[PDB]
Design a protein around this ligand. Structure first.
Ligand SMILES: Cc1cc2nc3c(=O)[nH]c(=O)nc-3n(C[C@H](O)[C@H](O)[C@H](O)COP(=O)(O)OP(=O)(O)OC[C@H]3O[C@@H](n4cnc5c(N)ncnc54)[C@H](O)[C@@H]3O)c2cc1C
Ligand SMILES: Cc1cc2nc3c(=O)[nH]c(=O)nc-3n(C[C@H](O)[C@H](O)[C@H](O)COP(=O)(O)OP(=O)(O)OC[C@H]3O[C@@H](n4cnc5c(N)ncnc54)[C@H](O)[C@@H]3O)c2cc1C
Ligand SMILES: *[C@@H]1O[C@H](CO)[C@@H](O[C@@H]2O[C@H](CO)[C@@H](O[C@H]3O[C@H](CO)[C@@H](O)[C@H](O)[C@@H]3O)[C@H](O)[C@H]2NC(C)=O)[C@H](O)[C@H]1NC(C)=O
Ligand SMILES: *[C@@H]1O[C@H](CO)[C@@H](O[C@@H]2O[C@H](CO)[C@@H](O[C@H]3O[C@H](CO)[C@@H](O)[C@H](O)[C@@H]3O)[C@H](O)[C@H]2NC(C)=O)[C@H](O)[C@H]1NC(C)=O
Ligand SMILES: *[C@@H]1O[C@H](CO)[C@@H](O)[C@H](O)[C@H]1NC(C)=O
Ligand SMILES: *[C@@H]1O[C@H](CO)[C@@H](O)[C@H](O)[C@H]1NC(C)=O
Ligand SMILES: *[C@@H]1O[C@H](CO)[C@@H](O)[C@H](O)[C@H]1NC(C)=O
Ligand SMILES: *[C@@H]1O[C@H](CO)[C@@H](O)[C@H](O)[C@H]1NC(C)=O
Ligand SMILES: *[C@@H]1O[C@H](CO)[C@@H](O)[C@H](O)[C@H]1NC(C)=O
Ligand SMILES: *[C@@H]1O[C@H](CO)[C@@H](O)[C@H](O)[C@H]1NC(C)=O
Ligand SMILES: *[C@@H]1O[C@H](CO)[C@@H](O)[C@H](O)[C@H]1NC(C)=O
Ligand SMILES: *[C@@H]1O[C@H](CO)[C@@H](O)[C@H](O)[C@H]1NC(C)=O
Lengths: 590, 590
């Protein structure tokens, strides 16, 4: 009975509460319920994205809806409508920062890329938090536990789009999280493989074995049968319905964590104006993400003393790291008109109608593609390194491990432009558009989150502060010039129609390149480290290596906020794994 | 793809809009979508009751949750939290009036009784609205079209609980609305059959063939396989999700119908704070029910001129009938301790655990019962008639048709008391409690609905005004004495434990009985006739026989508000049928 899984908004007691039915939230809630620790309730402000955002969150190719910087490019059924402070690195631009408000959280909204960090990143993690269980070899089983891998389908993809994978690290098939290759590869990506080789990027066997340098076809959180998005909702929550130990509270806003002495004992909740308190006998897990986890700590009395005093919040623990040390990745892309099919073709009615039938009848065609296909990773090579970087920049980059890339390239079968609104500004003049996006994997810029109010119903103040460190500025210009090197290869030339479409060659000098990047970049949505994992004796750390909040009892944080630092690339794989790990830490029954 | 059925909250155009995803709403929306008239959108303020009220709305025996008169006996996931004005007939009591806020509306909340009115009621309907298609023989196919009848299961019910039905009027099996007999009959009802005969109520072949006088086992909107509630959501909406012509907007509040000249062209909607306008090319159907249909007309400029002026609403049509002539039924019941299992046994943990397993594993046991089982109908008999009624009362009752009953009796395997809150005040002292409820089928009292604001987000002012006509007062006392006659039968005596438990024999005189009824009665939730069907030339009528709103174009009302008068007994059968009829009227493709 479906309804048996869903809670009634009144005072009651569970063994465990998880705040936030997002990526980490639904994973840890489902695993705790299955691991015999007693009753678990998960509290989520949103509903099902299948009811609240049409089929836009279910179709991989529709992932560009409601992610633009424009303040109005969102709707309240899937997005919080959060905007940044005026951004020092983006000419004081106030931008929309997309966050999932739904069961699945930002796993309902992401571009579905599944890629793990490097052995050396895991080594740095182990060192920073003083726990060797975070080293690659000890952590890997938690990465594998979640997965149901399906190999590439060569018949639907075409021979051109053959993949190089490492199945030995993609689990035993028993996990609920579908990971596979899309049934459709962008024709652009097929050409990009040759261009990547010409600029010195060797093919490797996927991005799941603890190394990145080189190129490969990406793996995605997509169901191999339906080519629907795989979120934490379609994977973990669907398994957890059927577990009588799991209760879901949806359309439910957590307002305050309650403390008796320094012990977390319950959560104040509002469901459609009805206030109630859920009590926890054992532990509360905060999984509200990089913006709202720190906000809930602060309005509950855990955070910087001066902030809590200024908003009349009684102090429970002076923890100055709460909302500090925010890390993020950025993305921007030039675009060309190309002589191959890209997502542009969906603007043509006769083409869309065929793609629509291919998707629903055969799980095939361009709708079955998340826009991306091939990722590539490098250090900026010599001799460009000495020309493009100051001595200070080269000294800072030499402190990163050899395996830790500086720049990520992503094939995109669509137009980025200024990323104001990808749907409105999608060029409609009858050409196919493709982009080569770049992301920077060594961000030095640090941001923060604070509050204007003790009410969690008021949005937090979000200041990512991207592109403010001189190292990020120099890297941003270098990455842009590498996209120009990609587009000047003889391998890619035959599909290009005329010169660079966006921005165009008139963007030439270092200062013009920087100015264009400052106008055309956005976050790639990897906000993290606002409840950073570190040593219990570090006054800036928020959680220890067991994800316990320092200064209080029976409270953990398990989400992107808990990361000690942002590892290179796409973090969802790591958040699934971290949730798997802290579930076993709590239960002891794995 | 589920999401393909659900709308995005932005400006867009459909051929038809239905306001209110309730009993009538989801029926007409689904049928219009199937009948080739183009695109249909349904707008509903609530969500799925399966997500928003646990399993309480899915289990028939849990129908007593959130229906009490106490102002706090509701939660915002299934109920509007409406209260009445101070009630002239109930010692100025301000009472909660349960209304479904969910897909299915009040079909999510009702006691699931399926019973039709009388041939003579249908004759009066035809005469009042000037349309012979409302006579029994012409209207019957619209009653049958909806249904999937399953016969009584004698093996699960027991031989004691054999039924007398007329399958020839219960359709061909093709309709989505499950109607059947419960898998479990209250032991109390089994005894009640003999007691009903002793006080002169003969067995008849069900309540679906245009006659009521006598007794029979009731038919219910329950799925025959699962013994889950059958709402308009589990029947019509579930069929309509496969129809690409149907779009659902849930968590969507309609604020205003828009008029160009006198033509309805769109609806102003708010979904979680996001305002948008849905446009209608052809017709708008208002299905917001007896309280909110008249409210939406008035805030849109259709209603009594003086009311709209007083709240700064521009006048579109002076229609003084809007919100007037409200009709309703009431219910109250004495109770006895009884020597048989009733719903009381669910307070015993060992009994509940077995009933829980019986329900989920075999669709059997007391959870598979809607509380009622046998209905009985009469005129107050002679010689009690001359003793209990004034000459004026007898003159008014003689104007009703011979087939139209004055009093309904309902077996109830539970305690009513003052109906403040059935769950809190459920006696827990170890006895089984049963009640014999009565409802009055000839209400003379008339109520109304008005507004305090042009904002549909502000609740309407709801004044049922029950028990204010001297005919209803005399009938209320007579009905109560007939419950005493039932409980003094020699047939029922052997299961009674001690004397009348509630109110008790100390309630003796006519004035004491009236006083007790005024304290212990509530609505039985049949609010209707606030957008009454009549002749186009009647200034008090709101809709014509085609359900078109008089004085404007392209606007219909199809719900309990549209009834010309309240027919005897349970109206959901008539609302399904009326929705079937106006669907065919609109489409011309049946
Ligand atoms: C557009 C986009 C693209 C991305 N692409 C990728 C990608 O391709 N690969 C990848 O690895 N990562 C990607 N990411 C990032 C990755 O998805 C996120 O880092 C991850 O989803 C965050 O997980 P989380 O559990 O930390 O938070 P979330 O998944 O955001 O979960 C937080 C949850 O808590 C709820 N919540 C917050 N406050 C409250 C409250 N008070 N009460 C109740 N509920 C509350 C929210 O509604 C939400 O459901 C992308 C992000 C976005 C936005
Ligand atoms: C507790 C209870 C027991 C009952 N028992 C029985 C019984 O056993 N048998 C029987 O025959 N009848 C019974 N009834 C009555 C029967 O269920 C109702 O008369 C019938 O459901 C009314 O249907 P409707 O479409 O007129 O209104 P509803 O089904 O109430 O539909 C109105 C819908 O419109 C929505 N809405 C209102 N305003 C807006 C707006 N502005 N924007 C968007 N959506 C809006 C509401 O949320 C609701 O879903 C019972 C009623 C109740 C409350
Ligand atoms: C309607 O919803 C209720 C859940 O909200 C449900 O109550 C729950 O019933 C489950 C059994 O399915 C109980 O869970 C049990 O879990 C372990 C199994 O590993 C048992 O050993 C325990 O005894 C425990 O009872 C929950 O205790 C119970 N929860 C609540 C809130 O009471 C009802 O069962 C549902 N009703 C029906 C008829 O299905
Ligand atoms: C994602 O959701 C969209 C609708 O919510 C859906 O678009 C809709 O698709 C249907 C076809 O499935 C169109 O309805 C058609 O119905 C009749 C058949 O009797 C046809 O003759 C008509 O031409 C009509 O097209 C709707 O027009 C269309 N709605 C809109 C707004 O376009 C998408 O198809 C869904 N996406 C996928 C990939 O399935
Ligand atoms: C619910 O819990 C809170 C705090 O424990 C309390 O303020 C409130 O009164 C409770 N409500 C009820 C009905 O007990
Ligand atoms: C993929 O979807 C199909 C069809 O819905 C389902 O049978 C399967 O379980 C899903 N796979 C995973 C691994 O979730
Ligand atoms: C690969 O195949 C697709 C579709 O057949 C085609 O559009 C694309 O150009 C091909 N690529 C190469 C490199 O030949
Ligand atoms: C956030 O960072 C900005 C820029 O570095 C700084 O000036 C601001 O005060 C910080 N806010 C908090 C509350 O730490
Ligand atoms: C009753 O429920 C069963 C199982 O869910 C289903 O197969 C059947 O179609 C339902 N019947 C109706 C008419 O809703
Ligand atoms: C009918 O049978 C049931 C046994 O299931 C019993 O509880 C009930 O009293 C019986 N009624 C009569 C009148 O014999
Ligand atoms: C939406 O429709 C209304 C109705 O006229 C009007 O405010 C405006 O034209 C539309 N707004 C947008 C954002 O298109
Ligand atoms: C509604 O009914 C009452 C009688 O109970 C009457 O006094 C009142 O004026 C009516 N109000 C409206 C607005 O018709």
């Amino acid at each position: 009975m479906l309804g048996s899984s869903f809670g009634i908004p009144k005072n009651q007691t569970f063994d465990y509460l998880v705040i936030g039915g997002g990526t980490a939230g639904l994973t840890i809630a489902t695993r705790l319920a299955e691991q015999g620790v007693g009753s678990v309730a998960v509290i989520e402000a949103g509903g099902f994205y299948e009811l609240n955002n049409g089929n836009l969150s279910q179709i991989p190719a529709q992932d560009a809806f409601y992610v633009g910087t424009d303040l109005d490019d969102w709707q309240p059924g899937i997005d919080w409508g959060f905007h940044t402070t005026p951004q020092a690195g983006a000419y004081d631009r106030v931008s929309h920062y997309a966050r999932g408000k739904c069961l699945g959280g930002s796993s309902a909204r992401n571009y579905m890329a599944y890629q793990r960090g490097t052995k050396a990143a895991h080594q740095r993690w182990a060192d920073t938090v003083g726990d060797s269980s975070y080293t690659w070899e000890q952590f890997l089983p938690f990465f594998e536990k979640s997965l149901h891998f399906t190999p590439a389908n060569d018949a639907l993809r075409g021979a051109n789009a053959s993949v190089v994978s490492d199945p030995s690290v993609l689990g035993n098939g028993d996990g609920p999280l579908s990971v596979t290759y899309p049934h459709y590869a962008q024709a652009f990506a097929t050409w990009a493989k040759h261009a990547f080789i010409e600029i010195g990027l060797q093919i490797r066997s996927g991005f799941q074995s603890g190394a990145l340098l080189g190129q490969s076809y990406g793996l995605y959180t997509i169901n191999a049968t339906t080519m629907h998005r795989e979120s934490s909702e379609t994977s973990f929550l669907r398994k957890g319905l059927a577990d009588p130990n799991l209760t879901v509270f949806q359309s439910a806003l957590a307002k305050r964590i309650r403390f008796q002495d320094k012990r977390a004992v319950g959560v104040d909740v509002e469901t459609m104006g009805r206030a109630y308190t859920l009590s926890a006998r054992k532990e509360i897990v905060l999984s509200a993400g990089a913006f709202q986890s720190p906000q809930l700590l602060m309005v509950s009395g855990v955070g910087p003393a001066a902030t809590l005093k200024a908003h009349n919040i009684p102090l429970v623990a002076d923890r100055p790291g709460v909302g500090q040390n925010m890390q993020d990745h950025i993305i921007y892309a030039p675009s060309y008109r190309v002589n191959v099919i890209t997502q542009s073709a969906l603007l043509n009615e006769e083409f869309e109608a065929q793609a629509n039938r291919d998707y629903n009848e055969r799980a095939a065609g361009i709708y079955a593609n998340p826009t991306s296909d091939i990722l590539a990773w490098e250090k900026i090579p010599e001799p460009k390194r000495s020309a493009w970087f100051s001595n200070h920049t080269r000294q800072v980059l030499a402190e990163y491990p050899d395996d830790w890339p500086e720049v990520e390239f992503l094939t995109m079968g669509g137009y980025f432009g200024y990323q104001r609104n990808y749907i409105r500004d999608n060029p409609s003049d009858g050409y196919n558009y493709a982009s080569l996006a770049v992301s920077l994997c060594t961000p030095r810029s640090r941001g923060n989150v604070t509050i204007t109010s003790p009410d969690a119903g008021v949005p937090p103040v979000i200041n990512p502060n991207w592109l403010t460190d001189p190292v990020d500025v120099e890297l941003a210009v270098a990455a842009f010039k590498r996209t120009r090197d990609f587009f000047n290869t003889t391998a890619i030339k035959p599909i290009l129609i005329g010169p660079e479409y966006f921005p165009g060659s008139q963007v030439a000098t270092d200062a013009e390149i920087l100015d264009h990047v400052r106008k055309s970049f956005d976050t790639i949505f990897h906000a993290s480290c606002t409840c950073a994992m570190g040593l219990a004796n570090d006054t800036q750390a928020v959680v220890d290596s067991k994800a316990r909040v320092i200064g209080v009892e029976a409270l953990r944080v398990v989400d992107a906020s808990a990361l000690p630092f942002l590892p290179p690339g796409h973090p969802q794989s790591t958040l699934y794994a971290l949730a798997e790990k802290i579930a076993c830490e709590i239960s002891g029954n794995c």
